[PDB]
Amino acid sequence: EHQLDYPFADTLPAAGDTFEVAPGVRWLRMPLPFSLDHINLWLLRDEIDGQAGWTIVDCGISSEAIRTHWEQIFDRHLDGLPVLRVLVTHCHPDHFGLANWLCEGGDQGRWNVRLWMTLGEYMFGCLMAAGAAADHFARHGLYYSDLVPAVPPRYRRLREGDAVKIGARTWRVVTGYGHSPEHCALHSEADGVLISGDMVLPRISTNVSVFDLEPEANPLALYLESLGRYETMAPDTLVLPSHGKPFRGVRTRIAQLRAHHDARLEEVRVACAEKPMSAAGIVPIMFTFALGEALAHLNLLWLAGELVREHGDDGVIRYARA
Ligand SMILES: [Zn+2]
Ligand SMILES: [Zn+2]
Numbered sequence: 001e002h003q004l005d006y007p008f009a010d011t012l013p014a015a016g017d018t019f020e021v022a023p024g025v026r027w028l029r030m031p032l033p034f035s036l037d038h039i040n041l042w043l044l045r046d047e048i049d050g051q052a053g054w055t056i057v058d059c060g061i062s063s064e065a066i067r068t069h070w071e072q073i074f075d076r077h078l079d080g081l082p083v084l085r086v087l088v089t090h091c092h093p094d095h096f097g098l099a100n101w102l103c104e105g106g107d108q109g110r111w112n113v114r115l116w117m118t119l120g121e122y123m124f125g126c127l128m129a130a131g132a133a134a135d136h137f138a139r140h141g142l143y144y145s146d147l148v149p150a151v152p153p154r155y156r157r158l159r160e161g162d163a164v165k166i167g168a169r170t171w172r173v174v175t176g177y178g179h180s181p182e183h184c185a186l187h188s189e190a191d192g193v194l195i196s197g198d199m200v201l202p203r204i205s206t207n208v209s210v211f212d213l214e215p216e217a218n219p220l221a222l223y224l225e226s227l228g229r230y231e232t233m234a235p236d237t238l239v240l241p242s243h244g245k246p247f248r249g250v251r252t253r254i255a256q257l258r259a260h261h262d263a264r265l266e267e268v269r270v271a272c273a274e275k276p277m278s279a280a281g282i283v284p285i286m287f288t289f290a291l292g293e294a295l296a297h298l299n300l301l302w303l304a305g306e307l308v309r310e311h312g313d314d315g316v317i318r319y320a321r322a
Pocket of ligand 1: 090092179180198
């Protein structure tokens with residue numbers, strides 16, 4: 001991380017509190033009970049139809065800790081203004097879980113506002129909250145509703161290239177692929193601010209996986225292509241990532257992510273040059289989730305013509321050179 005610039009140094013907002021990272025832009029940090037221990041949420045000062053308030057970006061999972069901290073932020077750090085709408089970058093549970101609860105005003109029903117989301121994320125989120133994977137993981141070498149217990153039944157659709165006026169800014173929708181169906185990052189070009197969601201994280205790489213639902217997918221190529229959207233943005237762009245700290249150096253970080261994935265891909269090349277490898281066989285070299293990440297690297301090489309697949313007489317799919 002030492003090649004990155006953290007403009008606020010050791011600053012981390014306390015739970016239940018905000019930190020102003022830019023005029024009208026407040027940073028909240030919520031605890032998560034996983035190895036990924038936090039998510040950053042954004043409170044944006046706003047005014048819609050003459051009414052001043054806040055646009056929320058991302059929600060937290062549905063947990064007692066996060067809910068309690070939202071109630072504290074409602075009580076102490078909204079200047080007595082309402083939330084005007086809830087905007088969600090993508091459907092992963094730490095971003096989307098509390099969307100319905102937020103939309104409907106939290107524990108005390110303080111407002112009733114609309115969810116803003118991309119169609120792919122909202123639809124996929126709906127599909128997943130309505131809840132096989134054994135015949136899929138076996139052929140490669142081997143609950144969402146707890147975190148998202150309700151979903152808003154309506155939404156206002158965000159699309160690539162939309163201009164979303166929030167307070168004094170025009171945030172441009174920048175869609176990203178490979179991590180999730182249709183990931184919404186928000187770009188404010190005039191002043192140089194980027195709400196990056198999970199597409200550009202300063203300290204950790206972005207999850208990229210192949211699942212049973214789309215088993216020939218190429219998420220890593222999609223992701224590596226999506227990264228070009230931030231590479232061309234201003235060098236001094238303030239990045240607001242959902243995990244880690246606000247930072248400058250987006251081009252430097254992306255250079256690191258591209259190098260990292262290149263090293264990962266090369267290890268997979270090396271392994272399949274020795275003998276045909278299954279996704280399960282790639283895991284110990286590369287590092288249930290991990291199989292999906294191994295499948296993403298194998299599928300990229302496969303779809304690029306660098307590997308061929310074969311269904312073995314034991315029903316395992318293996319990847320080797322042509
Ligand atoms: Zn995510
Ligand atoms: Zn995330």
